[PDB]
Design a binder for this molecule. Sequence first.
Ligand SMILES: C/C(=C\[C@H](C)CCCCC(=O)O)[C@@H]1O[C@@H]2C=C[C@@H]1OC(=O)\C=C/C=C\C=C\[C@H]1O[C@@H]3C[C@H]1O[C@@H](/C=C/C[C@H]1O[C@H](C[C@H](O)[C@H]1C)[C@@H](O)[C@@H](O)/C=C/CC/C=C/C2)[C@@H]3C
Lengths: 82, 41, 883, 225
Amino acid sequence: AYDTPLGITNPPIDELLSRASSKYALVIYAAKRARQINDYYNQLGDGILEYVGPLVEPGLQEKPLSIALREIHGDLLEHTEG
Amino acid sequence: SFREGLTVLEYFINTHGARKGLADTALRTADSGYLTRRLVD
Amino acid sequence: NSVPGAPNRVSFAKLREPLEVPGLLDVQTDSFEWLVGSDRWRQAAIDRGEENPVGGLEEVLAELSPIFSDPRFDEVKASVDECKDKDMTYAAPLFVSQTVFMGDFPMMTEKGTFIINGTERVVVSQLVRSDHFGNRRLRTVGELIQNQIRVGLSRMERVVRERMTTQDVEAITPQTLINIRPVVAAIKEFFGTSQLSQFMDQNNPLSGLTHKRRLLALGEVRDVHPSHYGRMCPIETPEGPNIGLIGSLSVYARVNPFGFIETPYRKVENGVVTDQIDYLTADEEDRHVVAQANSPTDENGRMVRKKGGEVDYMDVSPRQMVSVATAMIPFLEHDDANRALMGANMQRQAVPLVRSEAPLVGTGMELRAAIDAGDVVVADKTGVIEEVSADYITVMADDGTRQSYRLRKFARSNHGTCANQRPIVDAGQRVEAGQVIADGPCTQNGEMALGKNLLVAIMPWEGHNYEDAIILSNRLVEEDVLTSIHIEEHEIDARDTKLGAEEITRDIPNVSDEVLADLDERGIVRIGAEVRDGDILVGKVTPKGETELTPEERLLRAIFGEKAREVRDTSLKVPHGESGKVIGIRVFSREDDDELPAGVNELVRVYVAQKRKISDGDKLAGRHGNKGVIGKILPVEDMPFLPDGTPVDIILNTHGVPRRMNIGQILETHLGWVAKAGWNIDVAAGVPDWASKLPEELYSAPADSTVATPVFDGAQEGELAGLLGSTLPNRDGEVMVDADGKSTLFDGRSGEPFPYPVTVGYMYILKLHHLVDDKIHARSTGPYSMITQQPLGGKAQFGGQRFGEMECWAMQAYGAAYTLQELLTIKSDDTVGRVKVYEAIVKGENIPEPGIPESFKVLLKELQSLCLNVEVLSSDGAAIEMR
Amino acid sequence: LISQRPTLSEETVAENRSRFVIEPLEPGFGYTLGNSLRRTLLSSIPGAAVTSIRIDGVLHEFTTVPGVKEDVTDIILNLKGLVVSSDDDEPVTMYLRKQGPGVVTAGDIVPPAGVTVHNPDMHIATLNDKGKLEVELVVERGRGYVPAVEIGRIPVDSIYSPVLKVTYKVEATRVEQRTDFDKLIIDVETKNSISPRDALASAGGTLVELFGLARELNADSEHIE
Ligand SMILES: C/C(=C\[C@H](C)CCCCC(=O)O)[C@@H]1O[C@@H]2C=C[C@@H]1OC(=O)\C=C/C=C\C=C\[C@H]1O[C@@H]3C[C@H]1O[C@@H](/C=C/C[C@H]1O[C@H](C[C@H](O)[C@H]1C)[C@@H](O)[C@@H](O)/C=C/CC/C=C/C2)[C@@H]3C
């Protein structure tokens, strides 16, 4: 085991890299999803779009980027690379 | 090995070489940054 | 020693100092006095010199006449203090058929400085060649000033030649032909802008002392030369890319009439030291073989430098090659030149502490260096004190004369360091001439006190004193031992402008009565008021053009009945991150005639002081080049403490790796404990063999005794361990340190002792000018430059950090394309980007896509101006423009 | 004087392992009482353990015991793990004697009235063919950990205290205006004779009682809430 992660180090990058191609794809992967979540808490997505998530049970005041990372860790979303 | 202490003349000679290391170290950093830029370039 | 009120500081010197240290402030005075041609110089030179000496200006006219003679010099216009206050130049007008006034002539203070426009400047002597080392000439302050006058006079004669031809003969006079503008403008153009004219570096008395005496080497080339022995100090030079170019003068160095430095030498004849000390220039040095200072002389009477090489005349003493700053490092012979140079530089970087404690283990220069710096009050004539007050001191000399000395009280120095003088004498005290009456900023009882004596333990403490970090006891904060006052000066001006005249008034456009609560009736902060970051110091108002206000603002104007005032707000607030009390206010008005630059009506300056507790992050250092920041400050409870319960003050890790050494530091630490606890050799059946070389006086010494170990002639290893053996116990008689200088310390947290004995002692550390309060910067949003829309460091503060080219490389290395783009666009040059980002952040929306950085847009414009038709072509959009 | 209400929280690591936290403490009370707690839990809780034992067949033989796979040394280490609560106070001599090939698992030892073994599944030894083993072992209550000090009598190290391993660490929390408030973390692994919670109460009770000697000098002083 790896004991337990504290804050930013959770979830581990290794368990997250299995969900995407490279560490870079992981970035855009969670980045755009964070933009999606924060739109949901606001009025999203203006015209013709409806925000989705949070798929996982959000923390107390968890940051949307921190939510998109847990969602990717649980395979709750799939992505396609261009 | 300065444990015994150096007399007046002994310390003068030591400065002749010690100052070359500080000046020579000034040229080590400049060119390395000028080389690293061309490398990156 | 040899000074009247000198404190008792025993010395380990095995050699007598034959020649007293010369007035190490003479290099500046002699040259300027020779320049002006004072009667004291003529009287001093005539006694043992040419009977017809010519002053610098007198010599200038001698060569110029016939085309001028007998130039006059009236008494100084205003006093030094009066000049520094009114921001004028300490000068005395000079005069020269038709009489002519040539202009106000700057004058040199007793401290060897000049007041040029209210600031205390110091001219640096230049060492130019008259090839070989001895070929160096060395221009003195007075001489290189005269040369600047030559240019003024000569070009003045070039104007008179042209004027007399066109002008009618007999219809012109010296006044009509002489246009002294290039003369007065030549000296004003020197003391200012000139590279040899510099603002006196004075955050401690020693810094200003070494600023003078310091010389330039050029008019390979940086390397020291055999000739530099006893003349220029090779151990003192900047660490930056100016090594060798700059050097401070040696202690006993004396300059000859021309400028060729001379060194004191005692000619040795028949193997017996002759007390006759003669001047031997660089060239004259080779004529007679020079002997080494440290020489075996047995009782009464009794390795030498060859004429051109190494290893007739004997050296006057050790440390001839050493300078004042270098000669104040105890155990200098043990530290490497690098650390010694580092040590000297950091000694002049110390700050004056409120208490100013003298070093427990010092050398010899402390007393001489302090009184010669000029920052200590000296009694000119023997006598008795009549009054002693915090404001002034008066002495009733037996002669009958009556001298008084006004004390600098909380006077701001050139870099905000407080200079406060303390009287050390009482009412009935009988004082001798040349004695010390009041202590300067970094002085105690007459000798330099640049730091404090602290209890040290050289053990690594749970990683908090890692690499070069340091941990301190909270006692240094509670007892204000490392607390130093710092004064700041702020200024504002009211002048005439394009469309109106500025008016400094209390009434501010849009403000509450609370923010103006601490302002006076005129609008300036009241004395003694506490000012936080952003508070108003002076309320100034300047005319604003056509309002053309926003309707959304006019509506609220009528709603709340606040008439849109006429002009704009221009108040002087405290810079971000600053705070303190207001000490004084200086108001210079126009109604009150005064004298301000054309257009200026009123000029006021506020002085703010700050009591800086020694804070984690500040930079401390000893005299041996050892430096480091304060990594943590533990409460006195959880701190390694001796069996007495006496907590240690600072915990220093073992910085000195093998070979690196830094041996000198370890020595003064042990001696520090010796001097703090006294000693007694307990002589029984003679004295130990190690004390044989010692002179009687250091045999017995009480607790807290000060010691002096001159640089090369100081205490020796054997003598040390002996003093380690003798240590007077504390109350109860227990012993705290063994013969190894170690003690079993108790961890103030666990309570259990540290398994091994730890080295403890007293080391003299300094507080360096690098301070956290001055170096901490943070910025969310702030001002932006005009030409380039990049974040500009506002004069208040909020300066942005630079993301240089190299950092960009590191950002590209990570592949963080977005972070890089973010830095070079919305965080800087994006005119509409950074505003929409701030907007998006406040609302909580996503951050928008970056735009075009203004830098790039400016680039295209620069190209077009160069006639380069550049077009940002789209994939299918042909040409495009920014707009 | 009044403090800021430090609390006592407990997180259970295992059945006999739990960590505790006190939040927040005033700088720097974390280390003050911390080391004293670990010292009190470890060497101030009463408990019974084995003092000395004698095994039939080994009087001058040092290395081996015939008919048993475990050597002399290895056999002792097993018995050291024996946890038994004895309220008799004085040294009681229990007896364990099993024959024939098998596994002696403590449950075979007949405890005299007043002593109770708490780990009946403990593996003491393995038995060889047609082999018997009679073991006599002394058990007297004690405190902390007393090292080891008649023919064939072997003194053994005595693990008197129920607490087996204790460690503590400190951190900083409670921002507010001052962010250097102490948080005390203590880690205690206990044997099944008593729970980690009870061990803390005993250690805490003995401390307050021990520090009551300075309080009795004057109960009017200010101290803290
Ligand atoms: C580099 C230099 C002067 C620098 C401004 C300061 C020297 C830096 C070396 C160092 O401190 O490590 C040279 O100065 C002269 C002519 C050529 C050079 O000028 C140069 O190449 C560049 C500038 C020369 C003169 C500038 C004058 C004005 O620029 C400002 C205002 C005017 O005076 C300057 C004040 C300088 C005082 C310095 O004093 C030092 C500490 C600080 O560096 C400063 C307080 C003290 O340690 C003092 O003991 C050392 C003085 C240097 C002696 C050198 C004389 C030759 C201040 C920076």
